[PDB]
Amino acid sequence: RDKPAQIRFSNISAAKAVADAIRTSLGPKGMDKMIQDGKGDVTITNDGATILKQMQVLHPAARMLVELSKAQDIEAGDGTTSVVIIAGSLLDSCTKLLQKGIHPTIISESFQKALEKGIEILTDMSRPVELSDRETLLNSATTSLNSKVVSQYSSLLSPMSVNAVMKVIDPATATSVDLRDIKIVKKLGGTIDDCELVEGLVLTQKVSNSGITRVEKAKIGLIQFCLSAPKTDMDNQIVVSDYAQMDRVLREERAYILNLVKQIKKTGCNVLLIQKSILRDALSDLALHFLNKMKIMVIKDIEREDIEFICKTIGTKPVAHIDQFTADMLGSAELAEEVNLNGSGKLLKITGCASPGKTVTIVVRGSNKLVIEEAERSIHDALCVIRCLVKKRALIAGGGAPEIELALRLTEYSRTLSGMESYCVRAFADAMEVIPSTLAENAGLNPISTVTELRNRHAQGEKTAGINVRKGGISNILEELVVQPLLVSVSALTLATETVRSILKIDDVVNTR
């Protein structure tokens, strides 16, 4: 059928099509995008990273890219537009060579040896720095805190971006520094200068009110049980047809629980993290009143994040109903600390807990999530940047500028491959240098002067140099303060590689029904 023909283009098309208008990136280019959907709902969009995550796409190979958009985030946190913009670049090489009648598997074969050639030359042009060296951790994060949300605040975050790691980083070179490693928890209130590196496992949680424990020596709780009480876990001997009977069942409830909440405390507990679920209501809120009065932190229907970290970093297990007391399997805690800064937010700070040699916590604070996310998004990549340096060392320039060094150097090996793929390997070795030109894209008229100048002058940077797409002008892009870890783009290659290759693997007709 001509469908595999027509659709593989339609695959490449609506993949590349959406992805092509997706290049405004890297700098104040084009003009702001206010999106009002096919359902007619106003959105105001910008700064394609979010837009990449915002991206709502009909057609599957377009949906492939939203994935591919998110693919770069956890792999790097940098150059997510990169893997998205270059997605068309592989999609480019497909059709032209599919037109050429090159068997798309050959084109599919053309991706790896390239991906084998390509990421290497990036490593070949890579700029070595360290994973534990606070300065190399600073600079990469610095440039990644320079154009990211906070900079003045990053001056606090950049070291914490670094300081979090030296905990998390396992000795010298080690596979390390995941997102599970640095614990990033928002804290209501304060500001970013209130954002601080709060070491170990620090559980952000909603603890009922105060009169709570801010006091040292918690037994940090994990509790799957109800206090067994009238109207909580224990039978009510009183049926209510009456206001004397209805007032009776809550009194026997509230008068009873007061013993268990202290016994709850009698383990030494300044925390019991309630089961996330309900045994009936699970723990009565009338109970949770007196649990905190004995200074025991309670988050009823506890959020997922604490349960794991407390079972993970702290290593806490559920414990028996305090009628049975407990198994003392409450994880290591020397403190339950609930701090209100701005007077805002309730918290659990656990220091003196089991920790892997990882799980540094950063407690991200602000008068609103704005100030919070201001720090947060910046410090996170700064972590993820340093994370990349950890996961893969050295460096590359920011914004695909080194890819043009690759394009020159690679096309030769593409050429000198002289294989069926070499053609394809040459065709796509030339699909890189577009990316700085194509980010310039949307702004203006009398237009076209710089396009190949966004290219040629780099190609005339020898193989070592080109325009800085972040800062402007030609230099040796790899360290200009136009930088991202070597890890960042070599993934963007790999990430976009098999995605587009999967498009070449689309044949016959598929809609599952």
């Binding site: 020159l408 096309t411 030769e412 000198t416 053609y423 076209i448 190949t452 040629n456 002058r457 005339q460």
Partner: protein, 517 residues
């Protein structure tokens, strides 16, 4: 009075070379399926190269127009590689819009292509042998006329023409000091003989006039007498009333005929060359009454022929029979009466070693088609050596240089950079189109097939070997002996970007309402 815009027009221009170069792309080489022509006047025919077809085919468009225009100089000199630039310049043409589609000046693209030819030129310069000599170039012209006499009329090289190809071009070449003129060498078929009746003619060949064979057939001297005057009472190939007003004038005529016969037998012989080309027609009666006297008498001669053979001899013509000198006679190195075919008359072959200011080599045919199919071989095989003596330089062709000359240029790209690397890149690729396109017209997968000598190009350099042009299981240009005048390839090189360079010329794509009108 409507006006296309730039790229638009070029986009309209790019619509031209595609199909017309395409016609070549399955016609390239013997593995290329040659070209057919049909007529509004009802003539179906086979066509070849660019020139034959593209002249026989008619060209709508300035692009198509320049084709025949761009084409001529090629087939004129080298004769081989004509169809090539069509694909090539058409390929580069489709590289041009491409870089305009890549947003690169029509200006600039045509710029770095020019010296991109140079890095192919210097590349070509290296390829194969920049040398040949007489006993040597015999053999490549053997090879050249192998592939010439084996690709066109017959697929069997017939060594006669294969040697007939070498000798008379040399004859004008060795006369002109390793220079030769395709005008001077001439390929003349006359059917009724065979494609195996093939003649090396360094002089003129004309049917010897017999108004009677039995009245002695002979060729005399070695030399020819070229005459506007009578060698026997004259007549301009037009009807001359023979009547006699009395029964007695019947008696005197044939005497008068013979009195001037012997007198013109006398006065042309004393002039020289009893064989005498009388521009004048004459009665078959008395023409053979001189034949009855003597000396087969050449009459009913083409007005051009006398002066044609005159200038070839370098000698003049007798304008007036009372004027008699041997310089006004012609010069035959050898006059030779030669039976033309087994089917028909003896001719008089004048082979001029005296002076040949034209050399018309000869062939016959069982059919006028095949005999011209053969001349089609002969002309261009005489055309390569034409230059190929002026420079003895030869380069193994057929995609081996195309796969190669692209090597220098596309590698020269990132040596170049800015716009030139592109104009190195989208330049050199047009070269490997043809080995692709030759593998195309073959039963072959070109990219695959191209990939092969590619590996070689990484393995080896500038293969004297290469890919099969003959579609041989073995791939050389050596085993294939596919090698073209290292002129002609570069001569061919000279053509392609020129066209693109032509299509850009001025800024005016406007038309008054006249463009092709």
């Amino acid at each position: 009075k409507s006006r296309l815009m730039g790229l638009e027009a070029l986009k309209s221009h790019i619509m031209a070379a595609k199909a017309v170069a395409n016609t070549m792309r399955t016609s390239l080489g013997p593995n290329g399926l040659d070209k057919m022509m049909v007529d509004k006047d009802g003539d179906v025919t086979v066509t070849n190269d660019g020139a034959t077809i593209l002249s026989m085919m008619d060209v709508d468009h300035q692009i198509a127009k320049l084709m025949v225009e761009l084409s001529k100089s090629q087939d004129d000199e080298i004769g081989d590689g004509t169809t090539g630039v069509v694909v090539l310049a058409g390929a580069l043409l489709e590289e041009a819009e491409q870089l305009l589609d890549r947003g690169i000046h029509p200006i600039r693209i045509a710029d770095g292509y020019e010296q991109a030819a140079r890095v192919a030129i210097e590349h070509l310069d290296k390829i194969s042998d920049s040398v040949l000599v007489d006993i040597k170039d015999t053999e490549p012209l053997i090879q050249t006329a192998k592939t010439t006499l084996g690709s066109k009329v017959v697929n069997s090289c017939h060594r006669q023409m294969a040697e007939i190809a070498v000798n008379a071009v040399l004859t004008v070449a060795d006369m002109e000091r390793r220079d030769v003129d395709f005008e001077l060498i001439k390929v003349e078929g006359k059917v009724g003989g065979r494609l195996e009746d093939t003649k090396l003619i360094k002089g003129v060949i004309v049917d010897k006039d017999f108004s009677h064979p039995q009245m002695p057939k002979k060729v005399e001297d070695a030399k020819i007498a070229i005459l506007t005057c009578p060698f026997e009472p004259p007549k301009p190939k037009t009807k001359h009333k023979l009547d006699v007003t009395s029964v007695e004038d019947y008696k005197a005529l044939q005497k008068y005929e013979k009195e001037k016969f012997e007198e013109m037998i006398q006065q042309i012989k004393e002039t020289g060359a009893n064989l005498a080309i009388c521009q004048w027609g004459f009665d078959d009666e008395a023409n053979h009454l001189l034949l009855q006297n003597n000396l087969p008498a050449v009459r009913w001669v083409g007005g051009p022929e006398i002066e044609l053979i005159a200038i070839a001899t370098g000698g003049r013509i007798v304008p007036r029979f009372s004027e008699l000198t041997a310089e006004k006679l012609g010069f035959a190195g050898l006059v030779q009466e030669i039976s033309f075919g087994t089917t028909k008359d003896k001719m008089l072959v004048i082979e001029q070693c005296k002076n040949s200011r034209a050399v018309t080599i000869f062939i016959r045919g069982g059919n006028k088609m095949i005999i011209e199919e053969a001349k089609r071989s002969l002309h261009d095989a005489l055309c390569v050596i034409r230059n190929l003596i002026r420079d003895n330089r030869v380069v193994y062709g057929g995609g081996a240089a195309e796969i190669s000359c692209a090597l220098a240029v596309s590698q020269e790209a990132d040596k170049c950079p800015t716009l030139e690397q592109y104009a190195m890149r989208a330049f050199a690729d047009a070269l490997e189109v043809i080995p692709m396109a030759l593998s195309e017209n073959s039963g072959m997968n070109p990219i695959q097939t191209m990939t092969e000598v590619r590996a070689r190009q990484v393995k080896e350099m500038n293969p004297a070997l290469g890919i099969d042009c003959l579609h041989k299981g073995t791939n050389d240009m050596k085993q294939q002996h596919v090698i073209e005048t290292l002129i002609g390839k570069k001569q061919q090189i000279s053509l392609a970007t020129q066209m693109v360079r032509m299509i850009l010329k001025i800024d005016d794509i406007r038309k008054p309402g006249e463009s092709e009108e």
